[PDB]
Design a binder for these strands. Sequence first.
RNA 1: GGAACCGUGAGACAGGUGCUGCAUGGCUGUCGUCAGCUCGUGUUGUGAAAUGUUGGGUUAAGUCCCGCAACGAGCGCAACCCU
Length: 236
Amino acid sequence: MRDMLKAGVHFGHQTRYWNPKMKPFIFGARNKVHIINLEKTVPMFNEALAELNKIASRKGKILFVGTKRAASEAVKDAALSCDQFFVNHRWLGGMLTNWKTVRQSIKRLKDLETQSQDGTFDKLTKKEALMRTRELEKLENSLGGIKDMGGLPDALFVIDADHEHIAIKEANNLGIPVFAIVDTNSDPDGVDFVIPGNDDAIRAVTLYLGAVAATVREGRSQDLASQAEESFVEAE
RNA sequence: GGAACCGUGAGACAGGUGCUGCAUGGCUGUCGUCAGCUCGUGUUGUGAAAUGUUGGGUUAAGUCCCGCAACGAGCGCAACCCU
């Protein structure tokens, strides 16, 4: 299980771009950073983790959102260790509402690939061929992790409430739990299960994102394994 | 007996570029062949609607990025035909 006393990674962050709604989580600004209370972050871990093991052993799906280039690689690897979804690139309008039509783009993507591998690849003009290439690109860039979705999640996990504020909204009107590790620059009232921690910093996000993923595989139907996200922490 | 065309007598009936295209269909001219014109969804407004195509640098051009409540899509241009 997770470990306490993490005053060497997360802690305070951001200078003066905070939100008065995060006062009950700020220890005390010193020369710059406001500093977050590690004494309040721990209690949040328990409550947030508790609700996690509940949906984890309940065979519930989670969608880890991560558009920020600070945890772009961590959000994926963490979602790979387990059988969960994720959003790295950018978060279309009507993916869940107008699922049908949206999937039509997925089928076409699979239809073009089967035509790009070897079957009728260089039969028609090159101009038309270069037209099918761009389509594939645009489709592979947007429909990268949504291609595995064949049916409408139980909860979403964001890295930053503000950056992925759009994902938070659509997660509120639908009545779906929201888990995230944001800091000062945000509104906690928008997150039923918020984790007061550094939003940025790769070594900061990888820690929880790795522990949370480890707590998911355990108590479900798998054994614990070493985190491979630590290798990307060398970005420093 | 009787079909047909035709002529006279008799009966039932025809026609109109005569008016109105501010009653209209169709066709055509004109800004134009100039050119953009619109849709789905999200967001803003009580609403008619707005945003989407705002901002910074740039380009012949929404030409294209960066930031970005917007993200995408269908006619127009272009291409397809002919000298």
